Design a binder for this molecule. Structure first.
Ligand SMILES: [Mg+2]
Ligand SMILES: [Mg+2]
Ligand SMILES: [Mg+2]
Ligand SMILES: [Mg+2]
Ligand SMILES: [Mg+2]
Ligand SMILES: [Mg+2]
Ligand SMILES: [Mg+2]
Ligand SMILES: [Mg+2]
Ligand SMILES: [Mg+2]
Ligand SMILES: [Mg+2]
Ligand SMILES: [Mg+2]
Ligand SMILES: [Mg+2]
Ligand SMILES: [Mg+2]
Ligand SMILES: [Mg+2]
Ligand SMILES: [Mg+2]
Ligand SMILES: [Mg+2]
Ligand SMILES: [Mg+2]
Ligand SMILES: [Mg+2]
Ligand SMILES: [Mg+2]
Lengths: 127, 206, 101, 114, 151, 98, 82
RNA sequence: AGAACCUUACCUGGUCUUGACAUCCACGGAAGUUUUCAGAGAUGAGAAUGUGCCUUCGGGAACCGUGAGACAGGUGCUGCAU
RNA sequence: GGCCGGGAACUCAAAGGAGACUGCCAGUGAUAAACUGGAGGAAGGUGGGGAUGACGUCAAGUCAUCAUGGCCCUUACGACCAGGGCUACACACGUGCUACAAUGGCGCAUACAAAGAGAAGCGACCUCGCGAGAGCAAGCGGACCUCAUAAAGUGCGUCGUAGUCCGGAUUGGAGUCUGCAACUCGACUCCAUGAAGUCGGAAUCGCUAGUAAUCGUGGAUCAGAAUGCCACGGUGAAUACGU
């Protein structure tokens, strides 16, 4: 059947279904290149599969919403990693060593009262 | 002025709200204003009735007022005329049928509002302020309190230079939100101006 | 606020709901394009300004219901920022607690 | 390349070159070009005298260069002798459309005098 | 800083060439968070460097870095009221950081039509040791040679 | 079928409200769709705490309006009076639809 | 400025003040406080004493100053250099 | 956390003095609705039509207006009394 | 076409829980506290960010939120009104916004958010208008409807380094609509105009990662009137040798 993984990254949530296949990737009813114009976004969703040299043995059906190009790509790659361990638990060790298992918890720091941004203060004058 | 209000910081953790009703923005302000008016009138009438907190509920086009007091008999009166006349005038200023329940405070010396009010009355009667503060602190500690802090500010004894005197016996952890801190204030209107009284009463955690 | 300032606000609200209907239909005549005779619109704007100025809702400056403060007002509470904070800290505003996220 | 009594630049796209006419911005320039059936991107140099001539009378529908610059000066002069607020602001070289004069206002007042 | 010792942030390598070093150079050239705009600039500039040199993008880039990498730098230090410039050996990671920064600032300054052209031109001149970035590395080596009396 | 939308400022109060109302159902009327949570409205406020001229001194408050939807379907027409006539808790707003 | 569909604004009392003024041919200044009324062709030739906050400045209405408001011809701030 | 009027506290000139806001008041009176003239508006002068209280009823009101006064009113000063 | 039947898987929502505790391993340490690594784990050590501000200090700020002692005015220092002003303008500072461009800006096409707000309110659709907006008019007290098409981004053209197709201050017309009223003294639109400015002296500020920088979004106030304030997301760095 399908091996599912959820991937979250920076307000993006991905839904990754993997199947034994000839190698083909559709995300949001679109191919990888149709969806992610960014070249570094190309790599990110490919990073797990290239690492486990399983790029052609699996077919990926992915849905993602929220966030932006890098947020969705990182969430997609995180969801692939989860589904990849669902496919084969033994692969966790190599995926963790690559740094893909960890959920990236970096989030947009809130704006603070008295601060123009999360940390940027207004210009300070001595006198 | 650098301490968070002890009640407000604990409003969701340990302390409850004094107004527990729901409204949309259309009538939220009106309910809030009428709540203020009934509390304002009730404290004015029950000044000598030793009222600690007035709880307002508004279920289904009706106002339910729970008056916590250490003198329920004086609040209720003979056969309940005083609460009945209160119910009439509370209804006609809130605009809805009213129901006045009366909660009895077991020990008035452990409620911050009544302790602060007692000190304020003493100061307005020209009781020497340190004696009033010591009596309040000792009374709470002996009826059972894990701690009490009393603070008095203003022209103490008519002194031209205002100062702040405070006594703390026991334990009063204000940074512990789990701690149940009863806090309230009162103002004595002496011949030399306003004297501010603050009372913290610690009654254990959880 | 001064007592007279509070009295001005009360009178303005009273005038604005007394003439609310007349002002509404007068503004309808001026606003209308199809059923808009040039003379008919002309009397409407002349009529509209004969009503007392305080009947216009725009002349109302909503104030803190407890103090009459004309600044830092909140529509949801009908109070100024100062009265909102002390009623919030006293627990007299339902469900309103200090926020953190 | 002598529309409206001035020499519009060559070597530039007709839209850009045409806006050198005082009184023709980008909106009028592309309106004149479309009405004259000339593509926007073509250079003025590559235009033929026939194409340039239909441009000549196309901008003749718009008050441009001297006559427009007379009426704006007429309109400002109009205010100045009228004695209105706007005229007085024009007299003193101060902002006319209600901008602040406590600070800024340098465009109307020039560089700081002290 | 005073106490807390930093573990290095990890940089994902560039897509086209899979280089850790090149990805850092894109970061050096990135402005305003526009990494996509920076990525195209150095990808364009690298391939004209390849065509106009003869080697691959990485080899051509490495040649330019080698001619700009400093070895010793000065730092204004203090003993008493001294304020001398003290020559110190640059650690290998800072050598690449300084070379990339010097190339990027030189490329920005040398006015051309495009930044990729600017970057390609300066990268080429660095390869033949004529660039302004090479000039700045000469100044640093010259400045640290004058003050070699301190250590 | 007939939907009950409950909104209150306290989530424990709303959970108690939903718990009893669906156990008022399942006896007089069964097959409840369960209390759907629905997003909670976090209406935030930011006020100046100082009486005068301390702009960076602010208190940030919020009112969390918790929502609940039960969506009781298959009514027995003697579950309707059980659902009605209930006056459960003040501070909970009950909306009756269809 | 003011929408064309709503016409010009002239406050009613001033409008009927110049009504009798031109009807009677009276030439005495019309003391008004309505700086916000637009000039009408009717008022051409009249002299209007327009308030400026302190004084009623007399403005002789001419045909040229028709689409303007009374206040434009009565500056309120007095300033002559620093 | 938002000066066109309002806000508004400023000032120019138009006004009122138990007052705009209160409570006792004492009398007369439904108030509150629609209009007109003068006025820049405040306001003043009118024209109608409204006669409801709710009821130990006759009369408390809920208020409207004059007339006495206690008083009200002050974003006036002192944050170096609080 | 989640469009339909359906399904309760998934995302998500919001309640309740688990989880992280130096818990375990190794070394160092006074056999202590603890520290340094490692494993595991989503997270490793106060994980990130808030709230939370001790005794006191500055007679710090606020009698103009409010309250208040004491003074002071009481046919005025109170009260009402229309008009002005608070928006002035030889200057000088603070804080910002927009730029001086090609990592751009102009056109066309095309992706990906979050968080909010709505009943005299938000206001689809359709029609009219170059446009601001007008009509008509559903729906929505809302995970439903509306505000509301995110923009940087990407793709393809163009410009060709010039005070320019940069910049968009002025200033003339003409218009919208909010409100009794846009003159003083608004916001917006359209046509025209196209200033200073080519990166800023002495000096000086903020920021240690989703941070800075940059890009949009909306809401409190609010009839109307943000480049301010308060929030929200999108892309996303550099560097920390060290004292
Ligand atoms: Mg961000
Ligand atoms: Mg600030
Ligand atoms: Mg207003
Ligand atoms: Mg008030
Ligand atoms: Mg031109
Ligand atoms: Mg006024
Ligand atoms: Mg004013
Ligand atoms: Mg005044
Ligand atoms: Mg005064
Ligand atoms: Mg002080
Ligand atoms: Mg103080
Ligand atoms: Mg703590
Ligand atoms: Mg002082
Ligand atoms: Mg002071
Ligand atoms: Mg004014
Ligand atoms: Mg000001
Ligand atoms: Mg909502
Ligand atoms: Mg230009
Ligand atoms: Mg830090």
């Amino acid at each position: 059947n399908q091996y599912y993984g959820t991937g979250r990254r920076k307000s993006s949530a991905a839904r990754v279904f993997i199947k034994p296949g000839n190698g083909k990737i559709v995300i949001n009813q679109r191919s990888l290149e149709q969806y992610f114009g960014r070249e570094t976004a190309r790599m990110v969703v490919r990073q797990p599969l290239e690492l486990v040299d399983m790029v052609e043995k699996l077919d990926l059906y992915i849905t993602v919403k929220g966030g932006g190009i890098s947020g969705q790509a990182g969430a997609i790659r995180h969801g692939i990693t989860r589904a990849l361990m669902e496919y084969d638990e033994s692969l966790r060790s190599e995926l963790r060593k690559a740094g893909f298992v960890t959920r990236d918890a970096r989030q947009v720091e809130r704006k603070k009262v008295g601060l123009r941004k999360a940390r940027r203060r207004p210009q300070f004058s001595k006198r | 002025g650098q301490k968070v209000h002890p009640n407000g910081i604990r409003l969701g953790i340990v302390k409850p709200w004094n107004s527990t009703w729901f409204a949309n923005t259309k009538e939220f302000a009106d309910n809030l204003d009428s709540d203020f008016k009934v509390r304002q009138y009730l404290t004015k009438e029950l000044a000598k009735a030793s009222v600690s907190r007035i709880v307002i509920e508004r279920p289904a086009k009706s106002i339910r007022v729970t008056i916590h007091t250490a003198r329920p008999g004086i609040v209720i009166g003979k056969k309940g005329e005083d609460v009945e006349k209160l119910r009439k005038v509370v209804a006609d200023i809130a605009g809805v049928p009213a129901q006045i329940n009366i909660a009895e405070v077991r020990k008035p010396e452990l409620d911050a509002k009544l302790v602060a009010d007692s000190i304020t009355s003493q100061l307005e009667r020209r009781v020497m302020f340190r004696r009033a503060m010591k009596r309040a602190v000792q009374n709470a500690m002996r009826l059972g309190a894990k701690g009490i802090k009393v603070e008095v500010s203003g022209r103490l004894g008519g002194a031209e230079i205002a100062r702040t005197e405070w006594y703390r016996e026991g334990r009063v952890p204000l940074h512990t939100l789990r701690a149940d801190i009863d806090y309230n204030t009162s103002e004595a209107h002496t011949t030399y101006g306003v004297i501010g009284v603050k009372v913290w009463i610690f009654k254990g955690e959880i | 606020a001064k007592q007279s300032m509070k009295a001005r606000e009360v009178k303005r609200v009273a005038l604005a709901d007394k003439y609310f209907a007349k002002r509404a239909e007068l503004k309808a005549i001026i606003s209308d394009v199809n059923a808009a005779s040039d003379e008919d619109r002309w009397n409407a704007v002349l009529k509209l300004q004969t009503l007392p100025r305080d009947s216009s809702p725009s002349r109302q400056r909503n104030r803190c219901r407890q103090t009459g403060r004309p600044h830092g007002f909140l529509r949801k509470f009908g109070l100024s920022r100062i009265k909102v904070r002390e009623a919030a800290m006293r627990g007299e505003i339902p469900g309103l607690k200090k926020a953190s996220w | 390349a002598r529309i409206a009594g001035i020499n519009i630049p060559d070597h530039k796209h007709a839209v850009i070159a045409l806006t050198s006419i005082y009184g023709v911005g980008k909106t009028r320039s592309k309106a004149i070009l479309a009405a004259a059936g000339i593509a926007e991107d073509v250079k003025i140099s590559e235009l033929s005298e026939g194409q340039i001539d239909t441009l000549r009378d196309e901008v003749a529908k718009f008050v441009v260069e001297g006559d427009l610059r007379r009426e704006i000066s007429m309109s400002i002069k109009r205010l100045m002798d009228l004695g209105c607020y706007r005229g007085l602001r024009h007299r003193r070289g101060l902002p006319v459309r209600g901008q602040r004069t406590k600070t800024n206002a340098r465009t109307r007042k020039g560089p700081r005098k002290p | 800083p005073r106490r807390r010792v930093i573990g290095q942030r990890k940089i994902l390598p560039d897509p086209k060439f899979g280089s850790e070093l090149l990805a850092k150079f894109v970061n050096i050239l990135m402005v305003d968070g526009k990494k996509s705009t920076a990525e195209s600039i150095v990808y364009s500039a690298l391939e004209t460097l390849a065509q106009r040199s003869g080697k691959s993008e990485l080899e051509a880039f490495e040649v330019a870095l080698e001619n700009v990498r400093p070895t010793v730098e000065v730092k204004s230090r203090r003993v008493g009221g001294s304020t001398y410039q003290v020559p110190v050996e640059v650690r290998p990671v800072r050598r690449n950081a300084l070379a990339m920064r010097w190339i990027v600032e030189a490329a920005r300054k040398r006015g051309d039509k495009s930044m990729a052209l600017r970057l390609a031109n300066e990268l080429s001149d660095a390869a033949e040791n004529k660039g302004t970035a090479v000039k700045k590395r000469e100044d640093v080596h010259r400045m640290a040679e004058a003050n070699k009396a301190f250590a | 079928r007939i939907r009950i939308r409950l909104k209150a400022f306290d989530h424990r109060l709303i959970d108690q409200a939903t718990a009893e109302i669906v156990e008022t159902a399942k006896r007089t009327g069964a097959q409840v769709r369960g209390p759907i949570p629905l997003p909670t409205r976090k209406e935030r406020f930011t006020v100046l705490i100082s009486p005068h001229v301390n702009k960076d001194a602010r208190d940030q408050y919020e009112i969390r309006t918790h929502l609940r939807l039960v969506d009781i379907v298959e009514p027995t027409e003697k579950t309707v009076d059980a659902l009605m006539r209930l006056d459960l808790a003040a501070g909970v707003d009950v909306q009756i639809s269809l | 400025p003011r929408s064309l569909k709503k016409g010009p604004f002239i406050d009613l009392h001033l409008l009927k003040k110049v009504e009798k003024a031109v009807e009677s041919g009276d030439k005495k200044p019309l003391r008004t406080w309505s700086r916000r009324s637009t000039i009408f062709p009717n008022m051409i030739g009249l002299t209007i004493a327009v308030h400026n906050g302190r004084q009623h400045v007399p403005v002789f209405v001419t045909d040229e100053m028709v689409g303007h408001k009374l206040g434009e011809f009565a500056p309120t701030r007095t300033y002559r250099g620093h």
